[PDB]
Design a protein around this nucleic acid. Structure first.
Ligand code: ZN
Lengths: 60, 154, 128, 78, 99, 204
RNA sequence: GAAGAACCUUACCAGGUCUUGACAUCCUUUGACCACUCUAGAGAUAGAGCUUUCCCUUCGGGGACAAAGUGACAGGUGGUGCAUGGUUGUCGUCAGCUCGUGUCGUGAGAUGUUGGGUUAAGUCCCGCAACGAGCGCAACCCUUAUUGUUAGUUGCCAUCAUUUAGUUGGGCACUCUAGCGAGACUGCCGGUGACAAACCGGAGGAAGGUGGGGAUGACGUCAAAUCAUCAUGCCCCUUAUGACCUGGGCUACACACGUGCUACAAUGGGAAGUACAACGAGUCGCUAGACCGCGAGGUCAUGCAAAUCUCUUAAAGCUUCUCUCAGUUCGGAUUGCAGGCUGCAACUCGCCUGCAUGAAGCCGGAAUCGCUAGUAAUCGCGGAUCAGCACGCCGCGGUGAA
């Protein structure tokens, strides 16, 4: 029930408090980094492949 | 714990009396890391010591140690599924720790309005066979030797 | 004239000790001895290297301390002074190594672990 | 706290107006959620909508401060 | 004087190799370049839980790291401006010049 | 499941990323544009089957480059397909893309190509044990220090899933002076879906 | 799962509704649409209005585009984790798990991997028909603990002057910033031990016995969890279990259980004056200063795309008075009134301020939980998602135990 909703979220909103955040390549409503427009776990998958610049592992 | 004996952490002496015993006395008053308040009310306790029947500011603490410090305690050393606790001589550092516990950790119960009359006069009282911590040791020795016969062979 | 150097560090607090032949005091951040160092009794704490080297004075002390909490930045004053007393005379380094007051406390706040309440405190877990 | 006055929608006003000199009508079908009451709205008879039912209620002059949301209890605890 | 540039990248080796190249080309036609002043190197963290449905009691994190260098130039020639506009590469660092 | 993508362990230490950017205030636009860039080689991968694409970036230019083992279909007949791919990529980009072709050597010692080939034998109903063994031998014939292999799912068109794989040579997995590779690829003949994994090791 | 439920969020309801469709690909007719004002309404929509639009012209045409026809088709957050891939818990950072060659056994197989010592460990020495190797363990990685070189602004002030003021003249001296480097390996000595591994002390040093932490999770177990991130074998729905909109609900409460916050006051409450951190964030974002307000705050405005400007002068801290043991100047829930802020809109259902109110609660049975040192205990601060909303989560720092 989301292929209509992803196209719903590409439209200009009816008013200001409707343009929420979801992921781009998937459609998750929860836990999306707005700096990256990715969810928690597609970010995790692309983080290992060296396909996101910046990000490394973090030990200190 | 399981493998061998552990180290025991000797401490630093005072900034005034140069005492490790009074330092340990401060550290069994200290709650939530507030050391300066407990240290300052213990110096206030020494000031109450010095005025009312001022004899020696530290000998009164050593006589408070005199009338409290144990020599005996039972310990549940069963062997084959029994209840034969043995009155056993105590380690000397645990002995002094039980003494500090019976002095300070019983002094919550005086209930007087001035906040260190339960401290200063309380350790004044323990110098000369008064204070209920002496009779704590008395009843501790009396419940000791209750199995003097059938436990001292182990 | 000549001045005597020294530095001391503890508990994420750093100090720059500037020892001068004086009368025996300390000025910290252009203030007095116990205006910026509050009610704490930490005088013979700081004067404990003086009790093993040049008892008790008479050298005034300049220092500009910053960072950390008050007791940690107080304890770092001890080590720039002892480093300075090593700078003056070699004949006290035995008297310092018997007394310590030279080894930096490397022990500071411990890293947490993502998954607990604290650095080692675990949450309550009901068995039944 | 609505410091710049009351709030009543303008697509609430458009059912009837000519009941000012005559005896009022009975049908007021609405949504009855957002709009508060201010004294020009006294003594009507409104079918207050509670998500399922435009429940009829008429107005007293001291049922006057709160919105139209007191009289749409959407819990059904019986 | 009328020039100071900035360096921001991710890898300090690429930073100081390109910084040594531009210091080598700095007093070529000019003079009196200031060296590679370091900068406190801002850092971020994140938090991603190691599951897809549950299990928040085990997590995972990453980091952003932004290394920053700084090279100042005092009393320059006019000839180094057209020289430095002929200097364009590498591409891993982005310069930030003023006048 | 507990293990880690090993290229996500060694990155930053003994290799780098595949996007050498440094971008503020236009970062996610280029991220979800590079996401579109990676998808477009599905036209390649049926025939050209490249392994990695390194994407560097100038001020206003796009400067990409690929690695592959098959230089035939990617260079076209006379480079005419190359400019067509530049045009079709620029139609999605609008920006000056300047593509490049770099040929890999000792091509059997990849990660993605070997797993893609054994998934190709799985997509023609060829038996999994013999294909894995001849694959790890022909990778050992290339000259290496070790290959690990594992396949899972409903094996060989059967019922409830098993998972089994074979290995030879040495493979220090838990060590950081490693320089190893890794690749995962799906597989399906018609039944369900399968998966292959593949490993090499050649010293630091 | 939920690292942010007023509408949206949504899949759950009452209603208003629609159909090659809310979304994808081709065909022709055609080619480019739109966008915006007025009326109806709760909205989807309906009826008008300005007109739409060629980016090759070799009169020959499709690329940016709509509408119509049906044709292909689309769509399912519907089922099956016991048909799946991928991913993750748990034993558990437990110390195991195997191979080649040579031997033993008629044979399945065994020995190596057993015994003595020692260790955090299949870590190492000695005897042993076994000799060697691999995946694990350890090492290489990150941070913290000293110091050399290099480079000195937006950093610091020692050699002097100034100014509220390291400000401005000046220096890179100290500090700091972070690149390249050195440094801790039983390294030396003494005892114990079969002289062997190893154990116990000493000197040196910043740390001496893997210095302190982190990342790193073998063979395998539990048909453990997941079609509701994703992909998907098979089965079912299709003028509808698919789609658009309004309003409601997941925030109920006769009850029982788990997890956290605040108290039952004198190491304390209330009033006054008075100091020292660390991490990180900032363009439609943080706010300097000023004026006014009991306040939540309101207005004019200055710096800031950053070691410079702001968040931001931290709380426990320290000194004086206070209260005098009470259900109390403890406690701070509940309830009327008055407000402030973002939101189109705080009734269902945001946060905060002020006035009036002031309940339980004086350390909690049976039982049960966490923790061996910068730890436990207490105290503040920052960030994610975010118009708005945190006693939750992630991270830092102060005081500092038995
Ligand atoms: Zn995603």
């Amino acid at each position: 029930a989301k292929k209509s909703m992803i196209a719903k979220n590409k439209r200009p909103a009816k008013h200001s408090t409707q343009a929420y955040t979801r992921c781009e390549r998937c459609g998750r409503p929860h836990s999306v980094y707005r700096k990256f427009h990715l969810c928690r776990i597609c970010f995790r998958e692309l983080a290992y492949k060296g396909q996101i610049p910046g990000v490394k592992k973090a030990s200190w | 714990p399981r493998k061998g004996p552990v180290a025991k952490r000797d401490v630093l002496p005072d900034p005034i009396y140069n005492s490790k015993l009074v330092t340990r006395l401060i550290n069994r008053v200290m709650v939530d890391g507030k050391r300066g308040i407990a240290a300052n009310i213990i110096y206030n306790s020494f000031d109450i010591i010095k005025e009312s029947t001022g004899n020696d500011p530290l000998e009164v603490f050593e006589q408070a140690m005199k009338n409290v410090m144990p020599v005996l305690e039972v310990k549940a050393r069963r062997v084959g599924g029994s209840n034969y606790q043995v009155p056993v001589e105590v380690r000397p550092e645990r002995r002094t720790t039980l003494g500090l516990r019976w002095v300070v950790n019983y002094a919550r119960l005086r209930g007087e309005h001035t906040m260190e009359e339960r401290l200063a006069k309380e350790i004044m009282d323990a110098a000369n066979n008064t204070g209920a911590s002496v009779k704590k040791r008395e009843d501790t020795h009396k419940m000791a030797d209750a199995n003097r016969a059938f436990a001292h062979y182990r | 004239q000549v001045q005597y150097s020294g530095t001391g560090r503890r508990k994420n607090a750093v100090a720059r000790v500037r020892l001068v032949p004086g009368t025996g005091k300390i000025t910290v951040n252009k203030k007095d001895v116990e205006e910026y160092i509050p009610h704490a009794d930490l005088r013979e704490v700081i004067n404990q290297p003086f009790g093993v080297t040049e008892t008790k004075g008479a050298y005034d002390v300049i220092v500009n301390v910053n960072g950390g909490g008050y007791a940690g930045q107080s304890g770092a004053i001890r080590h720039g002074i002892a480093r300075a007393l090593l700078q003056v005379d070699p004949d006290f380094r035995s008297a310092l190594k018997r007394a310590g007051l030279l080894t930096r406390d490397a022990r500071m706040v411990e890293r947490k672990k993502p998954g607990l309440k604290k650095a080692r405190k675990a949450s309550q877990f009901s068995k039944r | 706290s609505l410091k710049k006055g009351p709030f009543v929608d303008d697509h609430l006003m458009k059912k009837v107006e000519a009941q000012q000199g005559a005896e009022k009508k009975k049908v007021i079908k609405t949504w009855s959620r957002r709009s508060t009451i201010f004294p020009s709205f006294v003594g009507f008879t409104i079918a207050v909508y509670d998500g399922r039912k435009h429940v009829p209620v008429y107005i007293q002059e001291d049922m006057v401060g709160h919105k139209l949301g007191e009289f749409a209890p959407t819990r059904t605890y019986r | 004087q009328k020039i100071r540039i900035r360096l921001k990248a991710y890898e300090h080796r690429i930073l100081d190799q390109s910084a040594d190249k531009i210091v080598e080309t700095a007093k070529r036609t000019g003079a009196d370049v200031s060296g590679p002043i370091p900068l406190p190197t801002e850092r971020s963290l994140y938090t991603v839980i190691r599951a897809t449905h549950k299990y928040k009691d085990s997590r995972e994190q990453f980091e952003m790291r932004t290394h920053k260098r700084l090279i100042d130039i005092v009393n320059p020639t006019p000839k180094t401006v057209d020289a430095l506009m002929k200097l364009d590469l590498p591409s891993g660092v982005n310069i930030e010049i003023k006048l | 499941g507990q293990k880690v993508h090993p290229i996500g362990m060694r990155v930053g230490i003994i290799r780098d990323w595949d996007a050498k950017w440094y971008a503020e205030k236009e970062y996610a636009e280029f991220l979800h544009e590079d996401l579109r860039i990676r998808k477009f080689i599905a036209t390649k991968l049926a025939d050209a089957a490249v392994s990695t694409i390194e994407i560097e970036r100038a001020a206003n230019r796009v400067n990409i480059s690929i690695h592959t083992a098959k230089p035939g279909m990617v260079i076209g007949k006379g480079g005419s397909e190359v400019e067509n791919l530049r045009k079709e990529l620029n139609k999605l980009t609008g920006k000056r893309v300047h593509i490049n072709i770099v040929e890999i050597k000792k091509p059997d010692l990849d990660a993605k190509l070997v797993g893609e080939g054994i998934a190709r034998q799985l997509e023609n109903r060829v038996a999994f044990r013999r294909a894995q063994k001849q694959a790890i031998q022909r990778a050992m014939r290339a000259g290496a220090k070790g290959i690990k292999t594992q396949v899972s799912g409903r094996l060989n068109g059967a019922d409830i899933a098993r998972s089994e794989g074979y290995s030879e040579g040495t493979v220090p997995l838990h060590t950081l002076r490693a320089d190893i590779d890794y690749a995962w690829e799906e597989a399906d003949t018609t039944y369900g879906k399968l998966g292959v994994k593949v490993w090499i090791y050649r010293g630091e």
